[PDB]
Symmetry: C3
Subunit: 391 residues, 3 copies
Amino acid sequence: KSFLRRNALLLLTVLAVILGVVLGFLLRPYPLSPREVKYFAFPGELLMRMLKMLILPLIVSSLITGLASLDAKASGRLGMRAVVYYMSTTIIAVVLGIILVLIIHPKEVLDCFLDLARNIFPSNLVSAAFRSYSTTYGQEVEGMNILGLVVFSMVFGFALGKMGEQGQLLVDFFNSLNEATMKLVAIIMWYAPLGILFLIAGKIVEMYMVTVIVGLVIHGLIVLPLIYFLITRKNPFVFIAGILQALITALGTSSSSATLPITFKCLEENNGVDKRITRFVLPVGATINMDGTALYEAVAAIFIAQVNGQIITISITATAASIGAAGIPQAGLVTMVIVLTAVGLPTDDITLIIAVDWLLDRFRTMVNVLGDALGAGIVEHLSRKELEKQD
Amino acid sequence: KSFLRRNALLLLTVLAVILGVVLGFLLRPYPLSPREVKYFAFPGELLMRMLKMLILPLIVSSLITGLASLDAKASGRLGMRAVVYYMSTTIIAVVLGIILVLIIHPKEVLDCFLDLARNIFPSNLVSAAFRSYSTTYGQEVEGMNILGLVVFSMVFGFALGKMGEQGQLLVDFFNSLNEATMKLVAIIMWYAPLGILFLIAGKIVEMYMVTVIVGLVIHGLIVLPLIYFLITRKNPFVFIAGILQALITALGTSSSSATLPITFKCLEENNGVDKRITRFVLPVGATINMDGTALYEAVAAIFIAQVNGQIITISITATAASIGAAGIPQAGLVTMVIVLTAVGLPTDDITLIIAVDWLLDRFRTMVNVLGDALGAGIVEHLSRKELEKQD
Amino acid sequence: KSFLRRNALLLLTVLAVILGVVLGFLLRPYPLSPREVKYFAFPGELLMRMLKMLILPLIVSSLITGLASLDAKASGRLGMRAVVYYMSTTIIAVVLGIILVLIIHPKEVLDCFLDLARNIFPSNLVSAAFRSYSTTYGQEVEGMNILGLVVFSMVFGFALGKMGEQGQLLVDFFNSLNEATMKLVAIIMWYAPLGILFLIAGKIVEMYMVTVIVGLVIHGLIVLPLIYFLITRKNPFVFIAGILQALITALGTSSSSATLPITFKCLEENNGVDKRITRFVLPVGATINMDGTALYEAVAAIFIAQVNGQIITISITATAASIGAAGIPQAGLVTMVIVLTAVGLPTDDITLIIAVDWLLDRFRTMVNVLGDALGAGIVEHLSRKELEKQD
Ligand SMILES: COc1ccc([C@@H]2C(C#N)=C(N)OC3=C2C(=O)C[C@@H](c2cccc4ccccc24)C3)cc1
Ligand SMILES: COc1ccc([C@@H]2C(C#N)=C(N)OC3=C2C(=O)C[C@@H](c2cccc4ccccc24)C3)cc1
Ligand SMILES: COc1ccc([C@@H]2C(C#N)=C(N)OC3=C2C(=O)C[C@@H](c2cccc4ccccc24)C3)cc1
Ligand SMILES: [Ba+2]
Ligand SMILES: [Ba+2]
Ligand SMILES: [Ba+2]
Ligand SMILES: [Ba+2]
Ligand SMILES: [Ba+2]
Ligand SMILES: [Ba+2]
Ligand SMILES: [Rb+]
Ligand SMILES: [Rb+]
Ligand SMILES: [Rb+]
């Protein structure tokens, strides 16, 4: 009984998945038009709006205070520690992806690299808050430029750190805002159980597929906790238990950015991790992490090759696509088109994967959110001395 | 002579209506193309831009400071007092509308209720400042989402109230901004006489109509002041005299939001009403008040029924349309289309009402602005003890 | 050797022009599609994004602190001193333009004056940060409304000045932001040499022309320094030497707004000019200065007259076009269409000038930036007593 009283929301979100699968399977014979399905998935559609609302005033305030709270020289070194994790776990994921297709075996290319660079330095910051760039033959398309806001908030936040006296007012300003936008997220958390059940129920009512989920669950729950135990020497599945209210949301939302306001709450509260490092690792992680998506795209790129050397060129192109899709609508659907041009394979295969990606996209995010959460834990232990200096 | 010296602007705006009708009737034979009429109505078209400019930094700052200045528990109870007024005066207005058609007698329906809920929780706050949602088969259409900004500013303002120490800096920030955006409104007030005369003169040069204005003037100047005298026990037409510089602007602007920066000045200055309650009742009132529009739409919905039980379904649909039209262009023209689908009557009748609505829209706002102004007065008297606690 | 150590960036930007002309002429035979030329001009295309990013949080913060730091009554008088320079140098430029065509001799008109007034008072401030108005038969077109933001920031900044106590927090806020957005500009300055060489090299690879450059260099380097020596009595080409890192950028960027963040740094650092006057003269100057463009448009308007009284009507129309083009894409290309309607000459001549304007546009900005820089110097000397009062 004492477990039900403490972990009330945790069990309710678990109940939401159970009831969500039940309600979906109960209302599986569909005599209703897809127009009506959209009307049904509405109590979960509202949760998405509330979460996406909070993305921007969280991402901007997180990194502005994050880089200013952290010492000017220490910021640079702590970042190397984050990139050490971000590049290592990405190499293992793309390596695991080639292993899975070996034993089992079941817009332009150049423009994606240019558009990514075009977004790193935004032309306008007001536009950046709801518009991203991707050249077409308007090139500024709908959907937040989270890459441009993260990059600007890094240097802007750092500029305030090196400003000290004059810079103190604005850091106090974004810390107040980060705390306010986190007080709003404690409320949106209570709508989540009602949301999740109406969100996953709507999405169900519409061997290669298994290949991804097989390697996905082993990289997530075996490779990553082994990286935590190797560096921190602490129990990883106790840490994973803390971020459960964040992991369940990830399995429904499918967006690391939309789940970031909850990922922030779950890590700060349940796991007890320092805000300065969560504001540093988490926003960047939920935007440039390749672990989850690289493993999903690796099997997705060698699948059409079976129907039909230079493996290094396939991985780099699959990386420039996902970082290029920060908050872009139908992200995995449009990015997989460019990777097929680099390998020279038809786009006829995509029309089949879309019908099953809806569930696969939920799983790739669950690994990405675990990668960012564990990434923070690994960073804190490897930088415990740098935080002692500030106190 | 002493009246001319004190009430200089008040008489100038009165003179603007007189000269506006004269200039319009003097330049009534129109050999000029509607392109040229737009060029003539320009010195009043600028006033609209200046007022609409000020809407957003007023609405956001008003409710942020409003909910933070007011005590956390008292905010909830004071709101019940506002909703008591907002739901009672709306019931009387829709009741008076059915009475007027009894003696005299002269996008989907479901989507309007969904889009309203879709706007209450905005997906992005930067977009919300100039874009509203209304699904079409881009669904985000031009025009400020005043509903989404009011709702966000309520919870955000409240979050700062419950933040105290850290939250003090941001409340001091939006109070400075509210005072600054009010110092700009004292200036825009002097352009108003020159504006009003060129605005109403341009709009003229282009039994059922009388039915609305008959009940409109009796609900406004008879029903509402009786609600003031019943609760406050104070003289209502002395209060109405204070908000005259606001009532005249309403008769030209036709938008409660565009007139709100002046409605704020008229109530704070001439009537001497506490800023904490004006920042609480007025922004919400100038967005969710149904009094004026419900009385206009009630006669507009039973008029086509004469050409041709379930009266409850007509009223709720007419409510979801006007709240859905916060700052939407050609508001009364597009909303009246949905109400005809619920009753099952043709849209052929709208092509006739548009030619006379231009003057009828000015009258419905005049009652709505009086409803929000008197609403504040009724709220202050019913919550004088809650404000004493803060001092 | 001591000159290379101090003026490192100054010589690098000089080297960028030299190497930029060399690389362009080396890669002059073009077997590559214009699609590939765009890909080549990319390391300079990024510099433009970084600069344009900084325009808005510089322009808004500059004038907000500028009008608040300066005394309420002194602001009005110091402005007359700026307009004295802005109207005199414009009269001389349009006079010099008629002289050049005398010896050598080698949307509606009304709507441009209406749209300019429509932009001075913006309808929305969020939209103003990335959208300008210009009626077409959406009228709000892409590109920052720098006119509307300058005008709003003037009155808003002044409102804070007249607010004192409450207003102190927000002025401290925009001064922190101006200092932060200037700390970002010191970094973007180091990318400029790499940018300029890839920017001008790409633009090359694609008697009347000489007529503009002849009068342009004599008004810039002869007329303007004579205005400095007549008022300040100080050496002008020592001042011009200080703003060299700004003049070189102007010869590549072609936009006074995009070069303003560097024009600000060059004047504050190298020349040692007071921030209060740079925040006052420079943003306004880089938006309403007609010197450079009026001289270019004067020769451009009387050139087609040769192919084919009321000279006063041609000058005023050429003024309403350039102020109307603050941050509008293909500015000189669309504005020259309206001036031809007022004189009654065909638009067949524009198709030829576009092929050479790319270099002529770079020269007109170089004079405009020199006009704003020298304008500040002339203003400081004519208002040295007004700044002593504040200290
Ligand atoms: C492209 O995707 C990214 C962006 C950032 C990062 C690292 C990170 C994380 N996680 C965070 N929070 O800050 C910094 C990082 C650095 O490498 C460098 C570090 C830094 C230190 C000192 C001065 C800087 C100035 C500008 C930008 C970063 C700076 C900040 C990694 C990948
Ligand atoms: C949909 O249209 C509306 C929105 C608001 C209101 C009321 C109102 C007015 N007028 C204002 N200024 O504040 C609050 C109101 C409440 O009912 C509730 C009250 C409140 C109290 C305590 C905590 C809150 C937390 C979130 C939102 C409102 C809260 C605030 C009425 C209708
Ligand atoms: C249309 O293009 C422009 C806008 C501005 C200016 C002048 C200027 C410059 N440069 C700056 N920085 O401030 C002021 C100017 C005034 O003439 C007037 C001055 C001023 C003084 C006192 C109160 C004011 C209130 C509102 C606006 C300006 C005010 C400010 C000139 C042309
Ligand atoms: Ba990674
Ligand atoms: Ba410090
Ligand atoms: Ba009401
Ligand atoms: Ba308090
Ligand atoms: Ba000038
Ligand atoms: Ba002072
Ligand atoms: Rb996703
Ligand atoms: Rb209206
Ligand atoms: Rb230009």
